[PDB]
Amino acid sequence: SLPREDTVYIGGALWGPATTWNLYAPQSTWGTDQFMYLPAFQYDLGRDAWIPVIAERYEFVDDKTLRIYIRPEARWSDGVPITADDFVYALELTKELGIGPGGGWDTYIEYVKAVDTKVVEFKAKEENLNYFQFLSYSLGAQPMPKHVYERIRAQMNIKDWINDKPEEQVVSGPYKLYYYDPNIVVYQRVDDWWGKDIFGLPRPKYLAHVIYKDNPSASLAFERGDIDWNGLFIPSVWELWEKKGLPVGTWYKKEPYFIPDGVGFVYVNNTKPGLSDPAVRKAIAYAIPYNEMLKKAYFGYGSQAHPSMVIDLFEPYKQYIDYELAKKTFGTEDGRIPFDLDMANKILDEAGYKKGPDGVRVGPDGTKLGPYTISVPYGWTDWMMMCEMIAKNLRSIGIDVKTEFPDFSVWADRMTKGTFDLIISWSVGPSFDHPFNIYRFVLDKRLSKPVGEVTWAGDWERYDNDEVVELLDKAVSTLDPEVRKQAYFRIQQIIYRDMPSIPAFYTAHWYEYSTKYWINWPSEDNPAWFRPSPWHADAWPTLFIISKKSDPQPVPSWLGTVDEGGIEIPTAKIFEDLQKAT
Numbered sequence: 001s002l003p004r005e006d007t008v009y010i011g012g013a014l015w016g017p018a019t020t021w022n023l024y025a026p027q028s029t030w031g032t033d034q035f036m037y038l039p040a041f042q043y044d045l046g047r048d049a050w051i052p053v054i055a056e057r058y059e060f061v062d063d064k065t066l067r068i069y070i071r072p073e074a075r076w077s078d079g080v081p082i083t084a085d086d087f088v089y090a091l092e093l094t095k096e097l098g099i100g101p102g103g104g105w106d107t108y109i110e111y112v113k114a115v116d117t118k119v120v121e122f123k124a125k126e127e128n129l130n131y132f133q134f135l136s137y138s139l140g141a142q143p144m145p146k147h148v149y150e151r152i153r154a155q156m157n158i159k160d161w162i163n164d165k166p167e168e169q170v171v172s173g174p175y176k177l178y179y180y181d182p183n184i185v186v187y188q189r190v191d192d193w194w195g196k197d198i199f200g201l202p203r204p205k206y207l208a209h210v211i212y213k214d215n216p217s218a219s220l221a222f223e224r225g226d227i228d229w230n231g232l233f234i235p236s237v238w239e240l241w242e243k244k245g246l247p248v249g250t251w252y253k254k255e256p257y258f259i260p261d262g263v264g265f266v267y268v269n270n271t272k273p274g275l276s277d278p279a280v281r282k283a284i285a286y287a288i289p290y291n292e293m294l295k296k297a298y299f300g301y302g303s304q305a306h307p308s309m310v311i312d313l314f315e316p317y318k319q320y321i322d323y324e325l326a327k328k329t330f331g332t333e334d335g336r337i338p339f340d341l342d343m344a345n346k347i348l349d350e351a352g353y354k355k356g357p358d359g360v361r362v363g364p365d366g367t368k369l370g371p372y373t374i375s376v377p378y379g380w381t382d383w384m385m386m387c388e389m390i391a392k393n394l395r396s397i398g399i400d401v402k403t404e405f406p407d408f409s410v411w412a413d414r415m416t417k418g419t420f421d422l423i424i425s426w427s428v429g430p431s432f433d434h435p436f437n438i439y440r441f442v443l444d445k446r447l448s449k450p451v452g453e454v455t456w457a458g459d460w461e462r463y464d465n466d467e468v469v470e471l472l473d474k475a476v477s478t479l480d481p482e483v484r485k486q487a488y489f490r491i492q493q494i495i496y497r498d499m500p501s502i503p504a505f506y507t508a509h510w511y512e513y514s515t516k517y518w519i520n521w522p523s524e525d526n527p528a529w530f531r532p533s534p535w536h537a538d539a540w541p542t543l544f545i546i547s548k549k550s551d552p553q554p555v556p557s558w559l560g561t562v563d564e565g566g567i568e569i570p571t572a573k574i575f576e577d578l579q580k581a582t
């Protein structure tokens, strides 16, 4: 019963049921992090700059001490000021509970301290000084409402709290929950949002997400005009406007249609017998039919990933790849891993795996290579097809793998708790600290948890290597790019030796829009925000950029770097200030 012209309908972001609106719970509902809880500074990948959001300003006291000045206007939706205590509390709670925003901060941050009501100070750890992580955890810090969470902690386990009462929801963002049921989640704009005199208001009054069971049903809704903002895999997407003449668009009008999101992996659980052998993981890498699955399953919307984990779609990242090592190791022109079942079988043969009567390999200890599952969420039809193609090839070489596609919530539980065998999942994307970010997320045991315990922070596969930890600790102890590069090069040697999990393809930043009710969507022709996908962590500025068709507004004046006429601080300026404070 929502007003259509004041509602943005969304697809491809929420899969399975609503769970909670609590970032410390094992699962929370799409929209919670994106729109309800904002950071100190919002990183802008498109401009390589930082929007001062809850923060007004930063200051380096020295190269290891960063003060963040909170806007006087920054205020929770219940009227309580956002204070330095809220920043300290959020991070200390994440450390205590082993889950929540800012996971891992305490590895590279010595302290977070409320030096005044509106001033928070972060101090870098010097033992393993890491300037990227220092900046990431400090500038990107997300406060959480201490006064709310302490009340909850007195009543119950914070992990059990649903936070599902609209009137009582205490948020820092411009939206909060309005309504939900088994078929929809709806958010409503906070009209007296604290940021209204700095950022304006987002244009939609409501954000609604009907819960579709699969891609085909979501696609049908999109074709009917019932989804405005979509983050969906869509086969033959160009035909929506070329053949069907629908008022629909993507970032690119021509192929590949989508900008890149990150790196999709075949994650292989290192804790399971058989899968714990690097030889088996290497064999799996050679048995993935990269080219065929990316054409048939992925419609050419993304290409094969480089095994270094570096996103070589961007020229400036190519310096971080030891191409000679990759070429030497894999025998291909660029060092990508070839699809080669002969090689996969050879690897298993040379590791002492012999096929038994049923055709399944048994190791020299003799661990049987199966039964295993490969799993992705039901309805994610592109990934499901990839899984089927991969599983069949693995069965061919004597690894007993079958597909299993449970509801998203169940899949996510098994991934985060590390009870899976194989899955396809995401990792990280292009960023100011790439490829440090992907090595940290995928390879760092410190971000993992025991099997049975939830981690959203990293290392789902439970890879355990102490040399990687040492290399991550030294990679950015100075800003000399050569030190970083050599750390990355050695990590790459370790990746090829251990095959902790398999970088497979560059994931698409799924993003489609309808112009029927909402206009000025970011695109190649209007590149106002480079992370517009409705499920992306950094989606929120999109909602300030779009207008109602019947009420067009100008571009928000705060957008753009300081030199361009907005309020965004270039990453280069932050590093300039850091070096100057040394």
Ligand SMILES: OC[C@H]1O[C@@H](O[C@H]2[C@H](O)[C@@H](O)[C@H](O)O[C@@H]2CO)[C@H](O)[C@@H](O)[C@@H]1O
Binding pocket: 011, 012, 013, 014, 015, 030, 215, 231, 232, 233, 234, 379, 380, 381, 382, 383, 426, 507, 510, 535
């Ligand atoms: O391509 C697989 C699948 O992706 C779905 O979007 C995912 C996205 O790929 C993932 O990185 C992010 O963390 O979650 C979103 C969903 O919130 C997309 O909705 C599907 O159509 C697609 O099959």
